[PDB]
A paper describes a structure:
As an inhibitor of RNase E, [name] has widespread effects on transcript levels in [name], although its physiological role in ribonuclease regulation is debated. We have previously shown that [name] can directly interact with [name], and it is possible that [name] plays two distinct roles in modulating the degradosome, by inhibiting both its ribonuclease and helicase activities.
Unlike the interaction between [name] and SrmB, the complex formed between [name] and [name] appears to be mediated entirely by the CTE of [name]. Despite extensive efforts we were unable to co-crystallize [name] with full-length [name], however, it was possible to obtain co-crystals of [name] with a peptide corresponding to the [name] CTE ([name](398–421)). The structure of [name](398–421)/[name] was solved at 2.8-Å resolution, and reveals 12 protomers of [name] in the asymmetric unit of the crystal, organized as stacked trimers that generate two hexamers. The hexameric form of [name] may be a favored oligomerization state at higher protein concentrations, as hexameric assemblies also occur in the crystal structure of isolated [name]. Due to the poor quality of the density it was not possible to model amino acid side chains for the peptide, but 15 of 23 main chain residues could be traced with confidence (two chains of 6 and 9 residues). Nonetheless, the structure indicates an approximate site of [name] fragment binding on the surface of [name]. Surprisingly, the contact site overlaps with the interface identified for the SrmB/[name] assembly and the modeled [name] residues lay in proximity of [name] residues Asp-50 and Asp-128. In the proposed model for inhibition of [name], the [name] would not contact the RNA binding sites located in the helicase core as it does in the case of SrmB, but instead sequester the CTE.
Author numbering:
A (entry chain A), B (entry chain B), C (entry chain C): 2 to 159
């Protein structure tokens, strides 16, 4: 599907490149789409609400504060996302149950693994501006990620 | 054989969690058991003594000081430990011959790999109070490890 | 083809050990040969000159200044390296297109992956004393590498 390196060559300055802090935890090597942003901390309630919805062509970008203390995505949440056809997830924080994740048809990029699950309370905000890995992400931007890296573009690419 | 995240979800607070500093190098993705502790540094003497003994039902939890300059476990020592029925090893230190270690039916968690072997002089204690990764380990505690993380408790679980 | 642990046991002090800074990106788990050093920075033009020449029995040792912002080697450059029989590349810097790199019959050790390509200007020097990861490299020196680590020696180790 997507080659981030080839797309950097083609699009040059028209993309930003996230710092190399992520690893792929999902069964899908590359993914792309238009992004919905979320900002939260050690609480995934809001991603539950968002992952219920259809996600075909969308990528969920999550600012979790870079917490590696508690996990934002586990098997339950990722199955939801696969079943609603979400292209992929970018988690500035942690994931859980990694053996189940490497088996699901979704990209998942994250910082680390930790077995403790996040709170479920529903705290946080969506469609807001977030910043991590030296990149600010606006809901509506286009992201592309593979095992090489993650890039962000205002306008779609191809 | 173990899903550390499920475990965190049932036991809640009754479980302690190790900082995400370790990776799996053994052929067993997940293992658990009652722990015997060792404290040593860039010497694997004691370990030979322990792993010569039958380890069925036990996990060797080794505070090697976090050294990544010398490897405490290689193929030979790991094979010994397989043959002696040891469930798994956890090294706050380094291993060696990782290609060989992947093929061996024992759990192995370490911080890093390094081709230089530990000395064999014998120095170190065992059954002593050790601490690393944000966790205190006591001989007779129970540990549970998968590709997601490492948990430790006083009583057995499940 | 090579076991670095083993060679440290046989040769001890006659070998220098590189710090655990690198990962494997190539199809070969292990490799070795006589090194030709390069010193450059976010530019890979010289790498193209060098890898056009026959590399059987040889390892390109690249001091790219540890930059993880620009990738010195990509699929295209590594395929040229395979075509001219090079044993391996050790990059003190980044690589690109990691999925393609895993399938090419050559050894590649590097620090990280970044999607952005290096400049092709050609700046840099060849066959010069370079230092990184606690080791100094001279053309003529011999390198042996695997998933456990990387070592350097003055004379061949067969």
């Amino acid at each position: 599907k997507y080659d981030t390196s080839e797309l950097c060559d083609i699009y040059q300055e028209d993309v930003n490149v996230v710092e190399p802090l992520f690893s792929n935890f999902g069964g899908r090597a590359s993914f792309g789409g238009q992004i919905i942003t979320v900002k939260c901390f050690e609480d995934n309630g809001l991603l539950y609400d968002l992952l219920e919805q259809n996600g075909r062509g969308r990528v969920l970008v999550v600012d979790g504060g870079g917490s590696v203390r508690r996990a934002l995505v586990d098997a339950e949440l990722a199955r939801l996302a696969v079943q609603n056809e979400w292209e992929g997830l970018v988690i500035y924080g942690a994931v859980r149950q990694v053996d189940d994740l490497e088996e699901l048809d979704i990209g998942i990029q994250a910082m680390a693994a930790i077995p403790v699950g996040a709170a479920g309370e529903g705290i946080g905000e969506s469609d807001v501006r977030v910043n991590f890995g030296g990149v600010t992400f606006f809901s509506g931007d286009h992201l592309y990620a593979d095992n090489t890296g993650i890039i962000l573009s205002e306008d779609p690419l191809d």
